[PDB]
Design a protein around this ligand. Structure first.
Ligand code: YE1
Ligand code: YE1
Lengths: 421, 147
């Protein structure tokens, strides 16, 4: 051992330098280099500590894997039980108050933590299962939703109709640009759709926009909120990891329920098929979503892109999933070089099932919904998803992503690009 | 057209003519026709035709022009502000109101500027080589923005 003590020591040097040095941007080069070196020693020890102790740490927090904790609860509890391993709620609030450029990068420590947890064959699957459980917010809204067929949330409007959960993304002023609230809404809505027994199929679609350049037109997604990202308001844990391990993973695998119904022994998860309809365009996080649907429809004029090839963050699990859809050459053209793919080009058929003229689209969406109803579809989509993406594959990738993305979230190149938007 | 013969010397001197529906500029040997009805997506009427034929005539007659370029200009209507648009075709409002002429619009464009893009301008016997090339023709490029 020796590693916990050495870490505690390196974290204290960091806190002493932060307490004594000037604010970020008033620091000299010597001072900038000193604090960077301190952060580096500490982060190195977080990695080494967790390489050997991750399972024991996770066992402490979850009572030897008998309590499912979601990400936000897990990292908070880790901070209080293991001071210096990951940041406290207080330390985060100071960070959140700063613009990205000025942050110390404490979230990186959370990336280290989550990487180590997800790498573990014991802890990893368990945390993934916790994130497939229904959100409390969704359990609380479920009876009203069953009664009313309707919930209005800040970023998402959800409506049950003809056996379909219609999720409409409705941030009309900013092209459905994504943030932490949207993720919370999306997961909540996805949870409701899955738990509601009067829902047989899901539908995800962008709502009518109100910004002058798009007034009266639907738009699917313009991807991550770049303004908020610059201003410091995009959370590694509560946005970037939450969406991947929560609603998006639930689209694929369903919601993990308690043993409280017949058939649980064969289907612990309630999964349903999902249709996405793309109006205008799907960019970044929105394009990423398409890699998880059972059916994808697009308007003739639409395009699909993951644009931040030069100075962007990793586009979620597109690096995991895209290759299976498009092969390695196209996958690199899209992600490494920012190739944008139009609905009407032949290669769109790698991502999109049906491309339809704007005036034929509503009806085509309605028909697609009726084709995905039965139990044969449920069984087949489950078997298809299992073959397409193994639980190990997903876990291994999300483990490395957790840290790789954390590092990109603080990269100088990203902070600069994002500040210019 | 007479209108083109009358504007030709100023055009040769200046490299530039502003018309109601078309802006014409000589640059690097290229006649750049920009269709510039920014309020209505270059919707066509009798005046646009006159301007087009005039511009096409100038481009063909001007000896410092070797190639033509047709392109839509930047729009100003709110739904297209800052975006180029090539053409939304015939002015349907005018057509309803009675202002689309069979002869001065629908036949004129086909037999005039459009046919001149294909066959060139018929000149008088007033230059060497007329016996083999009574028509001055040049190549044309079109660039389509929007639709
Ligand atoms: C969509 C566009 C091409 C349209 O161009 P225009 O028609 O000229 O529109 P604009 O006027 O710029 O946008 C209209 C309107 O939406 C706003 N808008 C559009 N997209 C955004 C984003 N992404 N953020 C913030 N605001 C936005 C824009 O600022 C305008 O509002 P005001 O500033 O208040 O006027 C353009 O707006 C654009 O470039 N948007 C940004 C596209 C982009 O780079 N998105 C981010 C890609 N990167 C990710 O998703 C990263 C990501 C997401 C994830 O979910 C996970 C992950 O691991 C990584
Ligand atoms: C082009 C559009 C799809 C753009 O649509 P939106 O994105 O809905 O934008 P809009 O707001 O409609 O257009 C902006 C602006 O341009 C005006 N606009 C656009 N296209 C036109 C046309 N063709 N005419 C008149 N005004 C037009 C429109 O009315 C708006 O201004 P306001 O009326 O002040 O609101 C739409 O406007 C439209 O439907 N245009 C008409 C398309 C059409 O059928 N055109 C005529 C087709 N038929 C021919 O050209 C026939 C023809 C032509 C010839 O030259 C020779 C011949 O032998 C036969």
């Amino acid at each position: 051992d020796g590693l916990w003590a050495a870490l505690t020591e390196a974290a204290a040097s960091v806190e002493k330098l932060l307490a004594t040095l000037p604010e970020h941007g008033a620091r000299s080069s010597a001072e900038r280099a000193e604090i960077a070196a301190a952060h580096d020693a500490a982060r190195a020890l977080r990695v080494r500590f967790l390489d050997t102790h991750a399972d024991a740490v996770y066992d402490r927090l979850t009572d030897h894997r008998r309590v499912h904790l979601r990400l936000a609860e897990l990292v908070e509890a880790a901070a209080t039980a293991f001071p210096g391993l990951v940041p406290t709620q207080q330390q985060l609030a100071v960070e959140r108050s700063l613009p990205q450029a000025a942050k110390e990068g404490h979230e990186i420590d959370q990336g280290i933590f989550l990487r180590a947890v997800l790498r573990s064959p014991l802890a990893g699957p368990h945390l993934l299962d916790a994130m497939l459980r229904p959100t409390p917010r969704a359990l609380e809204l479920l009876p009203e939703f069953v009664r009313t067929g309707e919930v209005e949330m800040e970023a998402v409007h959800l409506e049950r109709r003809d056996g379909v959960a219609r999720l409409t993304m409705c941030r009309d002023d900013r092209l459905n640009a994504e943030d932490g609230q949207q993720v919370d809404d999306m997961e909540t809505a996805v949870d409701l759709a899955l738990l509601d027994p009067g829902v047989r199929v899901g539908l995800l679609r962008g709502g009518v926009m109100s910004h002058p350049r798009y007034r009266g037109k639907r738009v699917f997604s313009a991807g991550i909120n770049l303004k908020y990202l610059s201003q410091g308001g995009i959370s590694l844990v509560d946005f970037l990891m939450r969406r991947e391990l929560g609603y998006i993973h639930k689209l694929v695998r369903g919601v993990l329920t308690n043993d409280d119904r017949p058939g649980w022994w064969h289907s612990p998860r309630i999964e349903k098929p999902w249709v996405a309809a793309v109006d205008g365009f799907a960019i970044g996080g929105g394009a990423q979503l398409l890699l998880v649907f059972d059916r994808v429809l697009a308007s003739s004029d639409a395009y699909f892109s993951l644009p931040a090839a030069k100075e962007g963050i990793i586009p979620g699990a597109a690096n995991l999933r895209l290759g299976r859809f498009a092969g390695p050459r196209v996958s690199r053209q899209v992600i490494l070089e920012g190739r944008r793919i139009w609905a009407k080009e032949p290669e769109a058929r790698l991502l999109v099932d049906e491309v339809v003229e704007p005036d034929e689209l509503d009806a085509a969406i309605e028909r697609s919904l009726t084709r995905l109803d039965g139990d044969a579809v449920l069984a087949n989509r489950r078997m298809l998803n299992l073959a397409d993406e193994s639980p190990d594959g997903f876990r291994a990738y999300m483990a490395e992503f957790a840290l790789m993305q954390a590092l990109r979230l603080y990269g100088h190149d990203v902070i600069d690009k994002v500040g210019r938007f």
